[PDB]
Amino acid sequence: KVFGRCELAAAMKRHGLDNYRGYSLGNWVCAAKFESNFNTQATNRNTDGSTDYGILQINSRWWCNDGRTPGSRNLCNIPCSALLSSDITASVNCAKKIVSDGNGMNAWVAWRNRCKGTDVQAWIRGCRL
Ligand SMILES: [Cl-]
Ligand SMILES: [Cl-]
Ligand SMILES: [Cl-]
């Protein structure tokens, strides 16, 4: 599913991501924009052989099981395929664990490089929330 911008903001809020660990909704929408362009089915293969999955490009090295990332963990206790669903529940619940791991949203390098320090409120501007 490719979400609309406000549609995704609303879904993220519904699932308790708004201001989670102090990160406003615009941060999360911005991260999703640059990670996946709002496409739940996004996948990308990393140089280390791991894969990133879903709207927030969650990585199989630590967070989910895909059966093909040697030496990896599955800390969200989910198959990576669950992160591709039109229902963002699994991605949100896993993101909550990731952002709580110590480095906040810096875990998403694209958030650090493209969202951090910017006017992230622009991502939810106009949205009925
Ligand atoms: Cl915001
Ligand atoms: Cl594996
Ligand atoms: Cl980047």
Residues making up the chain, counted from first to last: 129
Residue 25 is which amino acid? L
CB 17 within 8 A of CB 99: no
The strand order across the sheet containing 43-45 reads 43-45, 51-53, 58-59
Ligand 3 centre from 114 Cα, in Å?
6
Ligand 3 centre from 115 Cα, in Å?
9
Percentages helix, strand, coil for the chain (3-state, rounded to 5) are: 40, 10, 50
User: Is 18 one of the catalytic residues?
Assistant: no
Resolution of this model in Å is 1.2
Q: Is 101 annotated as a binding residue?
A: yes
DSSP letter for each residue of 4-41? -HHHHHHHHHHTT-TTBTTB-HHHHHHHHHHHHTTBTT
Ligand 3 centre from 37 Cα, in Å?
13
Residue 20 is which amino acid? Y
Token pair recorded at residue 75:
């800390």
CATH 1.10.530.10 fits 1-129, yes or no: yes
